[PDB]
Amino acid sequence: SSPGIWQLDCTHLEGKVILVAVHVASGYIEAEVIPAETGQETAYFLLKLAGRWPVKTVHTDNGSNFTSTTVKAACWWAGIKQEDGIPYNPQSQGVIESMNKELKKIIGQVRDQAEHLKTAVQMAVFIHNHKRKGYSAGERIVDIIATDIQ
Amino acid sequence: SSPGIWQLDCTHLEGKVILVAVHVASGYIEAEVIPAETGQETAYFLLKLAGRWPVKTVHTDNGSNFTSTTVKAACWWAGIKQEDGIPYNPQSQGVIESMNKELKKIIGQVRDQAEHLKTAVQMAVFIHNHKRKGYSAGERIVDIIATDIQ
């Protein structure tokens, strides 16, 4: 739960793959739709993420992305420590599952306002990050990181 | 230059279009490559940006994206005030130009490490946001927004 720790998560809808990164300490997320989960797609997504937030450590979502030399090359380039995703803490599996369930619920709630799944997923990222539960995840991530910088 | 103000900017390279959003108060940027600037591409980029940072106002980059009903629909959806981009302050005009020239310089310096332009542009976003000039733009943007939340 340090300021720089993120978890990758891959979930499926509509025959497509949604790759999500979660900032563990806040629950803030970024996500994208890709046709399938390859090391090149995962590597590009992590390069995007690390240019936008100070990403110190990534727990990868599965062993194929942990092994991928393209993902390792991107984590070298961007200064990220690439780690496995083992839930040594079983609360981990559970938190991720219930996030995927929450996102899929939101996506269903907006799905009819968008022709393409990718728009619906970015609507769901926006609603997830701005939901107050009281602060939102987008408020928590800024507070945490600002506290770290100071 | 309040915490929620961003400026769009469209620049060209390799026969492609790089769309950039600039957080005016910090100089932090997000950018993507698209084959050409359309209201649909611009609208999706602003939906992405506003799910990730608390975007209150966007000064659009030209009158076609100001007029575009697709862009106005996305700014409605995401709660953004869509504004023109008139440099009532002529310094504005100059600041954007010299950012495009800096990004293009950075892209040149990385361009041979990437097959695709879009990778080089995200490398350039990462180097720009982490450059210390002293704090970096990624540091300034978190400080500014956290101060606003508190």
Binding site: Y44, A74, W77 | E115, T119
Partner: peptide
């Protein structure tokens, strides 16, 4: 091809 995005 010795590129980050195409290690081939």
């Amino acid at each position: 091809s010795a590129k980050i995005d195409n290690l081939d």
